[PDB]
Amino acid sequence: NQIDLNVTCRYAGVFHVEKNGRYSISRTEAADLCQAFNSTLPTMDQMKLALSKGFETCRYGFIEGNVVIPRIHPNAICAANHTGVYILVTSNTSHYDTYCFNASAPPEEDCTSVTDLPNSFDGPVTITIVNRDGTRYSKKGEYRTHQEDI
Numbered sequence: 616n617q618i619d620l621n622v623t624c625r626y627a628g629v630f631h632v633e634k635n636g637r638y639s640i641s642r643t644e645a646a647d648l649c650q651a652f653n654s655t656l657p658t659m660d661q662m663k664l665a666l667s668k669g670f671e672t673c674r675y676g677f678i679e680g681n682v683v684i685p686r687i688h689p690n691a692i693c694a695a696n697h698t699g700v701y702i703l704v705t706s707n708t709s710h711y712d713t714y715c716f717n718a719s720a721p722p723e724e725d726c727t728s729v730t731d732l733p734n735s736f737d738g739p740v741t742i743t744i745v746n747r748d749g750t751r752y753s754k755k756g757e758y759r760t761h762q763e764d765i
């Protein structure tokens with residue numbers, strides 16, 4: 616019973632979380648997942664500030680109210696070569712990665728690794744935080760509160 620959570624640098628508190636190496640998070644699971652990091656889904660203003668500090672990904676993820684890709688450098692296979700906070704407009708499907716916002720993170724680029732999952736609750740799952748540099752932090756627990764996401 617294992618969940619891998621690939622996480623990024625934080626930019627103005629905002630970071631990206633990909634579960635199990637594929638788009639697999641529902642909006643309800645995304646809110647619960649950020650809560651395990653003492654975090655919330657970023658507002659659009661929080662994500663725009665993160666972008667301005669250097670944050671970009673090539674993956675769709677939830678923020679509060681939308682699914683987006685923050686882009687700095689145009690790339691034909693990332694948000695169709697757009698820059699800025701690219702907003703997904705038309706999709707059939709509901710599962711994406713998520714972004715999270717930790718208000719206690721540093722104000723600008725924080726590319727140290729994530730070494731804790733501070734607010735996970737008791738549970739049976741081995742949850743592994745996987746950093747971009749490969750360093751891992753694992754803990755037994757659970758973060759999902761909605762049955763439909765388990």
Ligand SMILES: C[C@@H](N)c1ccc(N2CCOCC2)cc1
Pocket residue numbers: 625630652653654717720727728729730731732733
């Ligand atoms: C580098 C180390 N002090 C550290 C950095 C970030 C985190 N996380 C906490 C959970 O939410 C995002 C950031 C944990 C520890």
